[PDB]
Amino acid sequence: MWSHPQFEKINKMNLETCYVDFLELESHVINEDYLKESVELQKLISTLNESKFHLNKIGIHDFKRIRELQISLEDDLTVFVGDNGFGKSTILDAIAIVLSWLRSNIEKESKPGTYIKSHEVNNSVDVEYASIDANIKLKDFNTSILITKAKEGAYYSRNNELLGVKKLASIYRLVNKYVDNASLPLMAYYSIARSYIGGGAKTKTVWSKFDVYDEIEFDRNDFTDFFQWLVFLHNRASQEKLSESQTTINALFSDIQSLKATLTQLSASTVIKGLELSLKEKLNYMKSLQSGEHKFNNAVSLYDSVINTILKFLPEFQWIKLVYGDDDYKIILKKGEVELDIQQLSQGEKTIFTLVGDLARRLILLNPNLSNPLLGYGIVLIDEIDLHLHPQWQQTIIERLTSTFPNVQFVITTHSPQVLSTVSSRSVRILQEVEVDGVNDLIVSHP
DNA sequence: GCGAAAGACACAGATTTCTCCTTCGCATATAGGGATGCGAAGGAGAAATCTGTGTCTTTCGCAACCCTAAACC
RNA sequence: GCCGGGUGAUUAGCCAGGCUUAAAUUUAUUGUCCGGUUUAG
Numbered sequence: 419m420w421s422h423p424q425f426e427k428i429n430k431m432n433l434e435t436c437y438v439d440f441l442e443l444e445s446h447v448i449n450e451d452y453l454k455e456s457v458e459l460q461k462l463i464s465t466l467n468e469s470k471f472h473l474n475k476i477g478i479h480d481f482k483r484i485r486e487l488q489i490s491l492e493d494d495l496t497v498f499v500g501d502n503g504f505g506k507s508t509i510l511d512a513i514a515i516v517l518s519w520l521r522s523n524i525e526k527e528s529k530p531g532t533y534i535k536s537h538e539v540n541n542s543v544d545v546e547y548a549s550i551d552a553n554i555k556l557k558d559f560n561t562s563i564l565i566t567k568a569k570e571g572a573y574y575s576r577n578n579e580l581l582g583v584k585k586l587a588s589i590y591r592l593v594n595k596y597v598d599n600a601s602l603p604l605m606a607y608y609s610i611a612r613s614y615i616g617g618g619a620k621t622k623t624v625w626s627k628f629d630v631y632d633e634i635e636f637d638r639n640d641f642t643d644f645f646q647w648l649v650f651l652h653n654r655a656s657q658e659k660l661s662e663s664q665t666t667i668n669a670l671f672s673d674i675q676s677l678k679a680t681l682t683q684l685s686a687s688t689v690i691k692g693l694e695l696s697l698k699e700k701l702n703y704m705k706s707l708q709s710g711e712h713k714f715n716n717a718v719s720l721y722d723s724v725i726n727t728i729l730k731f732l733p734e735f736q737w738i739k740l741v742y743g744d745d746d747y748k749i750i751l752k753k754g755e756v757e758l759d760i761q762q763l764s765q766g767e768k769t770i771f772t773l774v775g776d777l778a779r780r781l782i783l784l785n786p787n788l789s790n791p792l793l794g795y796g797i798v799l800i801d802e803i804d805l806h807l808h809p810q811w812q813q814t815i816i817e818r819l820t821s822t823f824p825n826v827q828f829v830i831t832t833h834s835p836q837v838l839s840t841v842s843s844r845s846v847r848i849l850q851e852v853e854v855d856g857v858n859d860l861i862v863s864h865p
Numbered sequence: 866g867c868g869a870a871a872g873a874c875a876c877a878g879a880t881t882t883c884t885c886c887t888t889c890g891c892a893t894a895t896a897g898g899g900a901t902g903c904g905a906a907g908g909a910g911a912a913a914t915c916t917g918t919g920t921c922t923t924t925c926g927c928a929a930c931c932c933t934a935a936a937c938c
Numbered sequence: 939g940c941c942g943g944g945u946g947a948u949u950a951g952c953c954a955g956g957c958u959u960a961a962a963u964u965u966a967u968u969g970u971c972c973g974g975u976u977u978a979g
């Protein structure tokens with residue numbers, strides 16, 4: 419996060435070196451026109467784009483029930499299996515704790531995050547403090563972070579390590595400063611308290627990508643904003659459906675009708691030539707513009723993408739519609755041959771509706787430049803995936819989650835043997851309780 | 866080890882709104898009188914949301930340094 | 939078998955292309971003007 423006389427050493431191509439070369443070039447040139455076209459910025463952007471977010475390893479010492487262990491996480495999927503009271507939620511809490519400081523530093527530097535509560539330290543007599551360590555590896559680049567808290571009543575101090583995460587956050591802020599539509603990583607957490615929001619604002623107008631960074635946890639009001647966001651998309655599509663798109667539509671149907679008329683009357687060149695020429699010319703002219711750059715128009719495509727994505731997980735339904743009533747809007751489904759309502763669904767269908775809708779909203783908001791926003795990077799944590807699901811749905815949820823979002827790392831903890839029948843052996847970790855050296859401890863043995 | 870300037874953590878309490886609780890007023894299907902059932906407002910008393918204050922965490926461009934080359938702390 | 943590490947030797951030489959060898963899931967070369975170590979004047 420500073421400028422240097424560009425120490426040389428051996429030659430390499432690390433992202434850090436490109437970061438410091440751009441900073442060195444910054445202190446000389448003042449005009450922004452040269453800066454926006456310099457080859458150093460192109461090198462930095464190209465290097466940053468091909469890197470894939472990935473948490474490498476984690477270690478927990480003397481936190482809650484866990485005394486000491488180290489875990490290695492896969493880059494696409496990992497599942498923790500155990501019984502009650504075996505510290506399944508402890509690991510997810512530790513990961514969210516270390517991920518909050520990175521979340522905080524992106525919005526503004528030197529901003530605090532989340533600490534350790536005084537009741538989370540172990541209750542043993544011989545303990546003195548608790549610590550958490552982590553590591554993030556983007557391509558060659560490696561960063562580390564340590565969070566620690568001393569037991570209340572002690573007279574010896576311990577502090578945190580925060581140089582790596584501040585250095586990493588500075589790169590993201592610098593890139594965002596010179597790129598119009600730079601993307602950001604995704605971090606989310608679905609705790610066990612998501613069943614309360616199962617169908618239980620001064621005219622919000624401006625939408626930005628920094629509103630999804632308010633919190634790392636999905637809770638309470640996020641459902642309400644989803645509804646407000648969805649109707650905004652619908653109105654945007656309606657505006658695109660009208661105006662000049664209707665003019666070419668007016669020609670096209672008439673040309674088709676004229677061709678149909680030419681087909682009739684015993685085929686009357688002449689009429690056929692005129693109809694064919696007019697149809698070809700109008701269609702070619704309309705298609706040439708293609709609303710600027712085809713998929714660049716978004717509008718209708720995004721709304722259909724989110725609707726079809728939601729309908730992917732509920733095969734028993736037909737369509738979902740938004741209807742304006744006398745004084746409020748409604749969401750109408752159709753199951754079988756009867757129209758339903760969002761408040762007349764079962765608990766299980768509501769859970770899937772909220773989970774998928776929130777995930778799609780976050781992915782769409784954080785990647786405004788990608789043609790298909792559902793291919794972004796990030797990490798998602800889910801606890802007790804088998805809530806309010808019958809065994810038929812328990813065996814196919816996992817492969818669908820990884821099928822729809824193929825570039826997101828997943829961490830999942832489960833409770834039942836139904837899901838274990840559909841997971842590879844390389845991404846299964848089993849917790850156990852054994853006594854070593856006269857002291858009880860927890861181990862993970864399934865590499 | 867830690868300047869100034871903003872957040873996190875823990876504990877109160879206050880307040881508007883909603884919801885439970887009398888009191889009687891129709892009503893209507895059984896020829897008037899009596900009975901079971903439900904609708905209408907006051908008047909509670911409960912509960913989610915917000916706001917207040919007091920205790921610590923991070924970590925400075927911090928009177929006061931040498932001018933030959935490489936590595937480590 | 940695959941991959942990831944070691945490096946003597948070659949090349950208008952921090953390229954490039956050749957020949958060897960090593961293994962539980964298991965390194966990512968760091969602080970000067972002080973300190974001791976190497977060289978030189």
Ligand SMILES: Nc1ncnc2c1ncn2[C@@H]1O[C@H](COP(=O)(O)OP(=O)(O)OP(=O)(O)O)[C@@H](O)[C@H]1O
Nearest residue numbers: 482483501502503504505506507508538539540541
């Ligand atoms: N401070 C503590 N000292 C000792 N043990 C603790 C402490 N805090 C929690 N525990 C232990 O944690 C155990 C439960 O841990 P945890 O909630 O992580 O497990 P889980 O049942 O797998 O999780 P979940 O049901 O929330 O998904 C309890 O049995 C308790 O003994």
